A and B are shown apart, each in its own frame.
Chain A
Amino acid sequence: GIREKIKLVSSAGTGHFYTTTKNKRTKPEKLELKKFDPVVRQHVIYKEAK
């Protein structure tokens, strides 16, 4: 079904992560977003995008 599951991991120490999908087959660039990290309790940067 093409679209593929990926995790966004917290740029902070905290091993926290969010979880989503993407069309690797067209948007191969890793995915970087600002998301709230509830361990540091601060909007930090999230990375990786499988």
Chain B
Amino acid sequence: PKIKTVRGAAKRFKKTGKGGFKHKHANLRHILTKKATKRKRHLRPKAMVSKGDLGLVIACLPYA
């Protein structure tokens, strides 16, 4: 049987050009008023999954 995708991972990580994964930052969902504008601003753009986490991400996305 085909491996099944961890469908929640596929809603959170996207595979990119050199084979990595972009992902949205954490902490820009609510409780916003107290967080510095600077802080929030650097959380807007997306980011790469870390070296230590590619194991896990990739495990969750055979078909990425």
Total number of B residues with any Cβ neighbor in A under 8 Å: 2
Asked if A21 CB lies within 8 Å of chain B CBs, one says: yes
Prevailing SS type, chain A contact patch = strand
Asked if B16 CB lies within 8 Å of chain A CBs, one says: no
Taking Cβ atoms with an 8 Å cutoff, the residues of B that contact A are 32-33
Q: Separation in Å of the A22 CB from the closest CB of chain B?
A: 12
Asked if A19 CB lies within 8 Å of chain B CBs, one says: yes
Chain A residues with Cβ below 8 Å from B33 are 5, 19-21
Taking Cβ atoms with an 8 Å cutoff, the residues of A that contact B are 5, 19-21
Nearest B-chain residue to A5, judged by Cβ: B33
A12 to B33, CA, bound (A): 22
A19 to B32, CA, bound (A): 9
A21 to B34, CA, bound (A): 9
Q: Separation in Å of the B18 CB from the closest CB of chain A?
A: 34
Chain A residues with Cβ below 8 Å from B32 are 19
Q: Separation in Å of the A50 CB from the closest CB of chain B?
A: 12
